[PDB]
Write an enzyme that holds these catalytic residues in place. Structure first.
Site, PDB file in Angstrom:
ATOM      1  N   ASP A 159       0.525  -1.194  -0.191  1.00 41.70           N
ATOM      2  CA  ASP A 159       0.045  -0.049  -0.022  1.00 41.70           C
ATOM      3  C   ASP A 159       0.954   1.421   0.013  1.00 41.70           C
ATOM      4  OD1 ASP A 159      -2.993  -0.616   0.269  1.00 41.70           O
ATOM      5  OD2 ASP A 159      -2.003  -1.931   2.011  1.00 41.70           O
ATOM      6  N   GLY A 202      -4.688  -0.172  -3.294  1.00 40.78           N
ATOM      7  CA  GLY A 202      -4.800   0.997  -2.705  1.00 40.78           C
ATOM      8  C   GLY A 202      -6.329   1.087  -2.043  1.00 40.78           C
ATOM      9  N   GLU A 257      -8.149   1.655  -5.774  1.00 42.89           N
ATOM     10  CA  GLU A 257      -9.306   0.966  -5.498  1.00 42.89           C
ATOM     11  C   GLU A 257     -10.206   1.759  -4.650  1.00 42.89           C
ATOM     12  OE1 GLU A 257      -8.389  -2.967  -3.425  1.00 42.89           O
ATOM     13  OE2 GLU A 257      -9.989  -2.238  -2.485  1.00 42.89           O
ATOM     14  N   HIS A 291      -4.040  -8.737  -6.635  1.00 41.92           N
ATOM     15  CA  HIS A 291      -3.486  -9.897  -5.925  1.00 41.92           C
ATOM     16  C   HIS A 291      -2.266 -10.384  -6.723  1.00 41.92           C
ATOM     17  CE1 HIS A 291      -6.132  -9.963  -2.661  1.00 41.92           C
ATOM     18  NE2 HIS A 291      -5.176 -10.708  -1.989  1.00 41.92           N
ATOM     19  N   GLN A 293      -0.173  -7.826  -7.968  1.00 39.68           N
ATOM     20  CA  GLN A 293       0.324  -6.712  -7.582  1.00 39.68           C
ATOM     21  C   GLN A 293       1.376  -7.315  -6.277  1.00 39.68           C
ATOM     22  OE1 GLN A 293      -3.048  -4.664  -6.727  1.00 39.68           O
ATOM     23  NE2 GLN A 293      -3.096  -3.521  -8.710  1.00 39.68           N
ATOM     24  N   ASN A 525      27.938   7.175 -10.279  1.00 42.34           N
ATOM     25  CA  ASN A 525      29.322   7.758  -9.706  1.00 42.34           C
ATOM     26  C   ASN A 525      29.552   9.089  -9.644  1.00 42.34           C
ATOM     27  OD1 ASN A 525      28.907   8.158 -12.638  1.00 42.34           O
ATOM     28  ND2 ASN A 525      31.031   7.851 -12.904  1.00 42.34           N
ATOM     29  N   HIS A 654      28.450  -4.432 -20.341  1.00 42.25           N
ATOM     30  CA  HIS A 654      27.497  -3.621 -20.543  1.00 42.25           C
ATOM     31  C   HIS A 654      26.249  -3.962 -21.660  1.00 42.25           C
ATOM     32  CE1 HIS A 654      31.456  -2.014 -20.158  1.00 42.25           C
ATOM     33  NE2 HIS A 654      31.129  -1.337 -19.278  1.00 42.25           N
ATOM     34  N   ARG A 728      37.058   8.960 -11.362  1.00 42.17           N
ATOM     35  CA  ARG A 728      35.809   9.568 -11.616  1.00 42.17           C
ATOM     36  C   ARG A 728      34.689   9.145 -10.788  1.00 42.17           C
ATOM     37  NH1 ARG A 728      34.323   7.124 -16.004  1.00 42.17           N
ATOM     38  NH2 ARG A 728      33.129   8.919 -17.343  1.00 42.17           N
TER      39      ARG A 728
END
EC number: 2.7.1.11
Lengths: 748, 748
Positions: A159, A202, A257, A291, A293, A525, A654, A728
């Site tokens: 919630d 909710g 909701e 449900h 969720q 970073n 990456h 960096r």
């Protein structure tokens, strides 16, 4: 001080409330940290019930008991619905099962109803000794466990309703769920003018519903705390059709909701469906998530958050005195805080009352802060407009510099919009600083950013290249296009490039404009911010494949995985993914390691692979060390584990970081993209003097960033000394404070 | 037992005689091992002189004092010519400088004259106390150092004259020298019929001269112990011209220095030069190598040999009792032995006398054994002939199987020759077992092997492939070409391929012939032989580039070298090159290492690189370990030595092993190539029954090999259980006995 702190202490954990993904992490933590602190830890199967019941519902936790629990959604200790504990005819027998097992410290993970039932349980605990003394057990026990009942409320509810906690367990993962659905609903609607009306969770709390709308560009939302006072249906359908001309395919009306109207006669997601079909006659389609969720696997964050509180709880239990009040561990500003239970409760209930009477202004306020902003911002980014156009309007530019990130587009979106909504002009720049330079500068109309919020990568184009070497061309352009302020979304070279801009002010009078750097890097970073946009997305990426690699078509059981994370020198990912996935080790730069250690990290995992553990995770920062490379760690781990186990090496590298932003990054990228543009407009007004702007102060050149409970503008230059330029990265990274926690969780 | 053995003991080393390369290694060893054994070690600069003199000529040795001494030729402690020590008017004052410094153990590295002067010094030591007691030093010293004079004769002389020692220090390196010269003289003579007359060293000992001739195919030799009785000049010039028709470019007449004729009127290398110019009138050219045979850098062997004796000496000193006689450490059969000094002397002088009288048969004999063989063999391989041809002659084949090696051709050479000299037929096989198979089989005439002795690689062609899978074709060929015996020069797959042959006997009646495997592999991995042909050559290769890599155009001092040797699983090279070059570590298979150690090998070299040592050598067997690879060892060594030193990695790999054989391999390859062919001829006679040969015994299928003091035929099958077939190596390798020595030399 320590290991000796909870010696002669026992604690029982209990998972009440509905299933909230990452409760499992909380548990684990609590256990692992409990044991660690010399204490003994007891499970309590089936919520408050196993407390009431007892016997076989209170089993002792081992270390091996909480193994492989981080990545499992819902609760494994069990969650029930005991309504025997809501009356005193059952609280006594729970109190009996407590002093009978010999317990002083109770951990209750749950939501508003489960944290209030333990609150009243602490307060009505004084008399439960004298009452369960009329025939309970020997009175030599009540004189050895007196005003010594310690309970910690760990907030767990999808919630996000509980107030006193910045976040609750699961709330992120739930968001993910909603998001994947909309992410699969939004990317198919190509036929008719489909108008989905997704009704989310909710009961009383509009959170999810708003956040989701602010992460999917919901055409309209309905939330409890501010119901749509007066004639809105015309508005909504004036706006759905206003949206249809403008040339739009699909519409997403989000419905909380607890959706109610002015008076309180609740809004129904079907009634809505009806209104639009009867009023506009599009091919509406209601979906009630419901449900699911609470399903799936917990998000990186929720696995992290839950380790944090679960450590905080343990701490708060063992640091509990007779005189200390009831305790509710919960995040705030990004720091663990112990908050009084009763106030947390007494106030998290004031809202319900404040909403029951028609005082929705008070409801909005009691929720308030960020919530109030999201609302404002959403609407404002949700508009159909924009306003009418002046000429004395200042003209802003927005750009992407550095490596792309999830959320770049989301920022961009909000900056312009917000920009334009001030009645200012927004220019858009393609390809970082190669942008003002070459001259690839366009004007952005309200539409230009239409539905980007969700799109991943960089829509404008981002390049790392730096402004100095070409100050001439860019100064020349700032004048030509009449640029008056910069907004730089990106990574370290935006900050860097920012610092570069400051220097330009000395030699050029054009760059004497203000600028804002919004941190958008995968690596996290960028100095002067706890987080950066795109982090969560990358982290969720790594964390996911870490779990999917925790399988492999092995010819046999017993196998170790070494995996090299990305992020240059910054251990953020590695560390975080290392914790969210529960790695035995995460080698990072900022925490240098000698073989001497390296050895003992292994002469350890082996001793576990020889027993309890069947799969092993080693995380490695791609640069944590020059010599002890991936190949060194790997081979070392291999040889030592010859016979005992198997071992593969995986370099994720990456893996296209231009995928799609998680809700958080979208929000984060949207929030800031408003926050700066606003600030920026104020800085441009204050440096307008004589028909020419002149920002030569250090205040006009800042990186916006997360620093504790508040976002903060900090001047580039003020940050120079806070940042390591060789690697960096920032000096002093907040999350190094987690390194130990990751370590004891591995049993060190 | 130990480290405690030489505690309260001191020893002085001294390097008498002429410079013999590797004396320096002996020293080092002696020192390093002396110190090690709790003893104290004293130098003695300038031979026996610094002994006589004293004062500043007797300086204490440190560990750092003998550093970088292995690879330096000549003597660094110094060698003089003190003739004060040959009379008692100087031996006393040396004895004075000895008990004055407080010394009981003397190490004298030298040749026949220097080992006899210490011998008489031990015997005339009893009275030198009572004489240097009339006024020398306090008589409380002679009652504390009495019959306790321990002296070890370490044989060092480029003559190889000393008898009692299989080898002397330097004798190999000297051979190399001679060899390089001839190797550069032999490969240029393309114009006229040039006839070099190289006069080598050798006062009384024909060794070098003969060995060199047996390694260069000298057209003729002159040696002391068997002078050319009677009219030879016609023979030599009958043979130089016999050699000119046959079509030959250059002639190499080798001349021992001590070259004498029947009567004793010495042969002069110029007088020779004259004879051939006056008799045949070719363009003769005399060269007198002289004192450059003492030059250069010591051969791998001599650096090894000298570490061995220098350890043996130390041992022999500290294990010396009043009752124990004078000691002369020296090789024999490949094992360190302590030999009585006086006998060694008394006998190494009998030869001189035996030669002084015209009894050259007795001289030849007192030298004898191998020497007598070399002689015989040389001549026999030196012939111009061969004999006349029968038909009841057995026909032999010779082949190369496996990886090529230096000496393959040398073997081949001797096998055939010897073969043919028995009046047998020799077939030659191109490309290993693909040889009998396809049918690439030729007949070898005496010439076919002409001047191969020096050529490196494989002239016939060698392939690894195995006979079984094609038994049909090869059996078919053994019959067609009428092969009656095999001689297999090569590596493990010759032994293997041999074992394969044995099995074939069961299914085929043709392969029921006898065979000999002569070990020819770079790796020295062939069971049932201490050495293999091509080893020394490869080892000298590695050892050389190890020294040339001990330089590098470094931007600074302080640098470590990790180098991966070859040789499959066999640590021979690595170990040997590791010792000959003085590596801090040589990681080998047969001695498995755990990181735990690996670490401490480093947490060590660093502690030296931080001080005494400026260049560092790590050797690594190419397979010593699967995980702790080159790259692992390297990186590990790197990181730990960050700042402290620099570090490069070098993989030598298999740098064309088809170069050119060292003398030893040529000899070894020539000796065996005779030894087997002889044996073989005897095995073929004993398995001739009824017009068909039938070798079905295990005795007819053998690998000839080095086992201690004697070469030995051992049946393949008898060796099965002595060999590890997974790693293709022998169980129990003799040189693992050196591993420790390599280790203390590094200071462990």
């Amino acid at each position: 001080a320590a290991k000796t702190l909870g010696i002669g202490k026992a604690i029982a954990v209990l998972t009440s409330g509905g299933d909230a993904q990452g409760m499992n992490a909380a548990v684990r933590a609590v256990v692992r940290v409990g044991i660690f602190t010399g204490a003994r830890v007891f499970f309590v199967h089936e919520g408050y019930q196993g407390l009431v019941d007892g016997g076989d519902h209170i089993k002792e936790a081992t270390w091996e008991s909480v193994s492989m629990m981080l990545q499992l959604g819902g609760t494994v200790i069990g969650s029930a619905r005991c309504k025997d504990f809501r009356e005193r005819e059952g609280r006594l027998r729970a109190a009996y099962n407590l002093v009978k097992r010999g317990i002083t410290n109770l951990c209750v993970i749950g939501g508003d109803g489960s944290l209030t039932g333990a609150d009243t349980f602490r307060s009505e605990w004084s008399d439960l000794l004298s009452d369960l003394q009329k025939a309970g057990k020997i009175t030599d026990e009540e004189a050895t466990k007196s005003s010594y009942l310690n309970i910690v409320g760990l907030v767990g509810s999808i919630d996000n309703d509980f107030c006193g906690t910045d976040m609750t367990i699961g709330t992120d993962s739930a968001l993910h769920r909603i998001m994947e659905i909309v992410d699969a609903i939004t990317t198919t609607a190509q036929s008719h003018q489909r108008t989905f009306v997704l009704e989310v969770m909710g009961r009383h709390c509009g959170y999810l519903a708003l956040v989701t709308s602010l992460s999917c560009g919901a055409d309209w939302v309905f939330i409890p705390e501010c119901p749509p006072d007066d004639d809105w249906e015309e508005h909504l359908c004036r706006r759905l059709s206003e949206t249809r001309t403008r040339g739009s395919r699909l519409n997403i009306i989000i419905v909380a909701e607890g959706a109610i109207d002015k008076n309180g006669k609740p809004i129904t997601s079907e009634d809505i469906k009806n209104l639009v079909v009867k009023r506009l006659g599009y091919d509406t389609r209601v979906t009630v998530l419901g449900h699911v969720q609470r399903g799936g696997t917990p998000s990186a964050f929720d696995r992290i958050l839950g380790s944090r509180m679960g450590v905080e709880a343990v701490m708060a239990l063992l640091e509990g005195t007779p005189d200390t009040p009831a305790c509710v561990v919960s995040l705030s500003g990004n720091q663990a805080v112990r908050l009084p239970l009763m106030e947390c409760v007494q106030v998290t209930k004031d809202v319900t009352k404040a909403m029951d009477e028609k005082k929705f202004d008070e409801a909005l306020k009691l929720r308030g802060r960020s919530f109030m902003n999201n609302w404002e911002v959403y609407k404002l980014l949700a508009h159909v407009r924009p306003p009418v156009s002046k000429s004395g309007s200042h003209t802003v530019a927005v750009m992407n510099v550095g490596a792309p990130a999830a959320g770049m587009n989301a920022a961009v979106r909000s900056t312009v919009r917000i920009g334009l909504i001030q009645g200012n002009r927004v220019l858009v720049v393609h390809d970082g600083f190669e942008g003002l330079a070459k001259g690839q500068i366009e004007e952005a109309g309200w539409s230009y950013v239409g539905g980007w919020t969700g799109q991943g990568g960089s829509k404008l184009g981002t390049k790392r290249t730096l402004p100095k070497k070409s100050f001439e061309q860019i100064s020349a352009n700032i004048t030509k296009f009449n640029i008056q302020g910069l907004v730089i979304i990106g990574g370290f070279e935006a900050y860097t490039g920012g610092l570069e801009l400051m220097e330009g002010r000395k030699q050029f009078d054009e760059l004497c404009i203000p600028f804002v750097v919004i941190p958008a890097t995968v690596s996290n970073n960028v100095p002067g911010s706890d987080f950066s946009v795109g982090a969560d997305t990358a982290l969720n990426t790594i964390c996911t494949t870490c779990d999917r690699i925790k399988q492999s078509a092995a010819g046999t059981k017993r196998r170790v995985f070494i995996i090299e994370t990305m992020g240059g020198y910054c251990g953020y990912l590695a560390t975080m993914a290392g914790l969210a996935a529960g790695a035995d080790a995460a080698y990072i730069f900022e925490e240098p390691f000698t073989i001497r250690d390296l050895q003992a990290n292994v002469e350890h995992l082996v001793q576990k692979m020889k027993t309890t553990v069947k799969r092993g995770l080693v995380l490695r920062n791609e640069k944590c060390n020059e010599n002890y490379t991936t190949d060194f760690i790997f081979n070392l781990y291999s040889e030592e584990g010859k016979g005992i186990f198997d071992s593969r090496k995986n370099v994720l590298g990456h893996m296209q970081q231009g995928g799609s932003p998680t809700p958080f990054d979208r929000n984060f990228a949207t929030k800031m993209g408003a926050k700066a543009m606003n600030w920026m407009s104020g800085k441009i007004k204050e440096s307008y003097r004589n028909g020419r702007i002149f920002a030569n102060t250090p205040d006009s050149g800042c990186v916006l960033g997360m620093r504790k409970r508040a976002l903060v503008f900090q001047p580039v230059a003020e940050l120079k000394d806070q940042t390591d330029f060789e690697h960096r990265i920032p000096k002093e990274q907040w999350w190094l404070k987690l390194r130990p926690i990751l370590k004891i969780l591995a049993k060190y």
